[PDB]
Symmetry: D2
Subunit: 208 residues, 4 copies
């Protein structure tokens, strides 16, 4: 069968990744990372395609971007930049507003979400693991009666049968733990450019 | 006298700005903007210098970046990228953590700010007008006893004698109202790339 | 008003202070001020690309880069055209070529121009040609090049120049209209120096002497 | 292990599916798959620049771009070197030149190489030269170029090549070590097409026929 492109870029279980010594990375993490799972540049290239897909699907009306902090911030900043790039340099434009929330399910911060009523909402999230977080978030947002909700997740783990399938998925990754590109381990590694797998040394060094 | 470079790039009262027809911008704002005050690219060039200055001053230890949402998000994303660029491509590196707050003074969202105790905090803000907001914020953050607090503001208006002087200031602008580069008018114009002065048509079109 | 002139930089433009920006450390003390920051050049190129795509989209174009000074403007203009072509419903299919110009006088004092490098320019017959150049001064260089290319019977020739001096030749696409000053940076040189400078700048007397031939 | 080989792309590398990325619409249906996405090329160039700065920082270098295929790798490598030079305490002072190579056989079947364009290469005497090239195949081109430059007595010559094929010549700086396949994109061409393609790709049989000479 032809691929299901809705899965995003498929990173296989036997993917060895890229060797950190061949790329640049924050020097304070020297010795703390095992390998590069997804280089920064491939993330940006993939986001270019997602932005084009999103514009096709929901560019016909205003978009309310809802960033899921903190891990979503880089994917949201870059995705928004790509959408902006289209709205100014092509024939196709979309008015965007942006908001930011943190999840505890309690939603922390953000505007009064009654402002979402009748609007097209694009949730921007870092990674789907079990899918429980996204299912709960959708259930909470749906109560404000937006016109539609789309979920973009940079990463989706391959696991279970009760997963969550985002509308826009960057990469489908093995069921392992990832950091970088704003994703953290105990608040560290958000400043790392590439998505990486930490090594055992890093796991202990940054342990709480 | 030689210039006070702490003022940042000085945009004079008689600055005519740049004509929108010579640049790109979100097409949904066609007819809604008067002129470009500060092109996107000059903002990025200035941030490059600020990042270098910040690394000189406080790169010697970990930096806790505190983004003042929503208007600070683009300046914070770009400033962080420039700091990251230094931490990976030069000889000088700094570990950064990031957090996000909204101001109401109540601080909305963010981590437990007791985690700021004994740390070096870099507040990242969009624009200083009267300076009241930054003075109040500093007074609130100081109560958690960080080791030091630095304030980066992209813009500072030239006004009063009781102003606030940020540690890092991008541009000193005339005392007028600005949007773009995440700065809004009634939630609009955050997706505009350049910092602009809205025209009378835009003021009415987007009025609440 | 006349947008064909591009961004107008006025004679009393004081420019930007180097101390507020980053620049090559090896040129500290050689430059007087920034005439045009790197970032505004990129912003302006974005619009030139959009303008070019409006005029010649859905066609094949041969981009002809005038080395050496044109290389940075050409690389960036081409990237912006590529951007539109993959991210919008308009494209240009691009080929690229590179030429260097050497102007001289013959035995009766007639100006001649040798075109160095490049493909066999007979390959331009019936093609759409976009010349990409750094700066128009007197305009003599672009007038000579145009007549050289025109003899191969291209379908059309358009000229993009990053800078045009106020003193003439009018390019189809002009980034900035600048005072009549010698400028360097963004690949533009003084005696092969300063091409690695990011911002378009004016050099001081120390820089003029230090890098003199 | 041997990091001098660069990023190793294996023979059973399936590449990336074009349908998951953006690319020039005019090439839809001409390409089989993405061998190396644009973004990983940029990431790798970042590290090559850092490596080069470690080896030759605080010195003057002449960057020698091998046109046409080298232009994109050279523009981007140079931008990354410029980045370090203004944002760190190490710099290289750079000049740039451009050459095109034409290989032929003489009347006794000896391989010759004409160097087209460029400065008078006598100006390389005592200089540090960084050659920037797109791809090493058999290595014959780089061996010929090196011996041509060496006769002008430069202080040193280093070679950066974006791609090196497994089949030899070993550049000082190599981006990626690739299977022995014909590749295009990132300025690399097939019969002058595909230079405007963003990603390094392998073309299909339709593309091979359509753009044949
Ligand atoms: N940084 C990081 N966050 C993760 C990872 N896996 C899941 N998360 C985050 O953990 C939370 C739980 O995910 P869930 O299992 O509900 O899909 C979500 O906020 C998700 O984004 C991971 O590997 N790294
Ligand atoms: N978007 C936008 N925000 C502004 C402008 N001037 C001040 N602000 C914001 O208004 C608040 C009040 O500023 P203050 O007068 O206390 O310095 C701060 O959040 C400041 O960033 C402006 O011109 N545009
Ligand atoms: N680097 C540099 N080149 C210039 C400047 N002015 C003119 N040129 C170059 O000098 C040559 C002669 O320009 P023309 O007078 O024929 O327009 C052209 O190649 C033009 O691009 C300048 O200020 N700086
Ligand atoms: N566009 C393209 N050029 C190639 C490829 N392989 C080799 N070349 C170019 O072909 C010429 C001969 O390579 P050589 O065999 O001498 O290493 C060189 O200019 C080299 O850069 C390829 O796969 N694609
Ligand atoms: Ca999350
Ligand atoms: Ca987390
Ligand atoms: Ca503010
Ligand atoms: Ca506001
Ligand atoms: Ca020229
Ligand atoms: Ca010159
Ligand atoms: Ca070659
Ligand atoms: Ca070729």
């Amino acid at each position: 069968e032809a691929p299901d492109y809705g899965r995003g870029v498929v990173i296989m279980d036997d993917w060895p990744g890229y060797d950190l010594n061949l790329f640049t990375y924050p020097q304070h993490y020297y010795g703390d990372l095992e390998y590069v799972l997804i280089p920064h540049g491939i993330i940006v290239d993939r986001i270019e395609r997602l932005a084009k897909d999103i514009m096709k699907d929901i560019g016909y009306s205003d978009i309310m971007v809802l960033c899921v902090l903190k891990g979503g911030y880089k994917f949201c900043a870059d995705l928004v930049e790509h959408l902006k790039n289209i709205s100014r340099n092509s024939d196709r434009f979309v008015s965007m507003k942006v908001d930011f929330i943190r999840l505890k399910m309690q939603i922390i911060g953000g505007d009064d979400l009654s402002t979402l009523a009748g609007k097209n909402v694009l949730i921007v999230e870092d990674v789907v693991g079990t899918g429980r977080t996204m299912k709960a978030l959708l259930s909470n947002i749906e109560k404000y009666k937006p016109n539609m909700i789309k979920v973009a997740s940079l990463l989706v783990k391959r696991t279970r049968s009760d997963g969550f399938r985002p509308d826009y998925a960057g990469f489908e990754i093995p069921n392992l733990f990832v950091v970088g590109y704003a994703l953290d381990y105990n608040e560290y590694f958000r400043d790392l450019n590439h998505i990486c797998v930490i090594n055992e040394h890093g796991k202990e060094k940054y342990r709480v």
